[PDB]
């Protein structure tokens, strides 16, 4: 897991798209993450 910290206006889709990964793979690395309720400062895996 490469970590990334959620910033204002971030979405799981935009994070995935910017890194050239599928949103499904991103979800598989992020244990039931709630993509419609992200918190500023939340830490996610991007690899
Ligand atoms: Zn894949
Ligand atoms: Zn939700």
Ligand nearest to the CA of 38: 2
Distance CA 2, CA 44 (A): 8
- Measured in Å, residue 20 CA sits from the centre of ligand 2 at 24
Entry resolution in angstroms? 1.8
- Could you say which ligand is closest to the alpha carbon of residue 39? 2
| Burial zone of 46 (CB within 10 Å; 0-12 exposed, 13-18 middle, 19+ buried) | middle
Indicate the class that CATH gives domain 1-47.
Answer: alpha beta
Please give the span between the terminal C-alpha atoms of the chain, in angstroms, as a whole number. 5
Kindly write down the DSSP assignment for every residue of the chain, as one continuous string.
--EEE--TT--HHHHHHHHT--HHHHHHTSTT--TTS--TT-EEE--
Paired tokens of 3:
């970590």
State how far the Cα of 21 lies from the Cα of 37, in Å rounded to an integer: 21
Known binding residue 25? Answer is yes
Residue 24 Ramachandran class (φ > 0 left, ψ -120 to 50 alpha, else beta) = alpha
Query: Solving technique for this entry?
Result: X-ray
Neighbours of 44 (CB within 10 A): 20
Is 10 flagged in the annotation as binding?
A: no
| Interatomic CA distance for residues 44 and 47, integer angstroms | 9
């Amino acid at each position: 897991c490469t970590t990334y910290t959620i910033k204002s206006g971030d979405t799981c889709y935009a994070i995935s798209q910017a890194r050239g990964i599928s949103l499904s793979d991103f979800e598989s690395w992020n244990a039931g993450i709630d993509c419609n309720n992200l918190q500023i400062g939340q830490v996610v895996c991007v690899s």
